[PDB]
RNA sequence: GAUUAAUAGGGACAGUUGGGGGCAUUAGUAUUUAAUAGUCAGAGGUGAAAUUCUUGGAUUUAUUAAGGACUAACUAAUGCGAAA
């Protein structure tokens, strides 16, 4: 079935809480998790990943994706 | 036998005032770099782009450290200095 390699116990009342550091520039937009810690990175995601095109990078568009 | 004592000037003294100067000290993030951890495929840059950087793992994240600068915000029709 699903083997989430996250967090042991949890709860429907539990917040598990994530870190995401958020960086926007003019030229591109960045969204990555992490703990608490910021030592242990979870989740990456660049505009530029989103779109084939340079100047697309930083759009709305891509940072929905 | 020595004119006043200039809202003339020099000097003394008293509480202040100042981003004035010279030495020492000392902080602060920031840029750059390195270390130690993470994670991955793109970062940069532009009107678009391309030179660049990237799996030898960049950009990115956390913690430190090195090294030169620089004193933000408060900061003003405010202050000081002969001007710089
Ligand atoms: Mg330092
Ligand atoms: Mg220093
Ligand atoms: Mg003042």
């Not at 937009?29 to 990456?44: A, C, N, P, Q, Y």
């Not at 995601?45 to 697309?56: P, S, Y």
Request: contains cysteine.
């Amino acid at each position: 079935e699903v083997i989430s390699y996250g967090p042991p116990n949890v709860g429907a009342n539990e917040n598990v809480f994530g870190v995401c550091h958020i960086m926007a520039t003019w030229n591109d937009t960045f969204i990555h998790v992490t703990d608490l810690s910021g030592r242990e990175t979870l989740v990456r995601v660049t505009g530029g990943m989103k779109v084939k095109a340079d100047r697309e990078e930083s759009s709305p568009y891509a940072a929905m994706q």
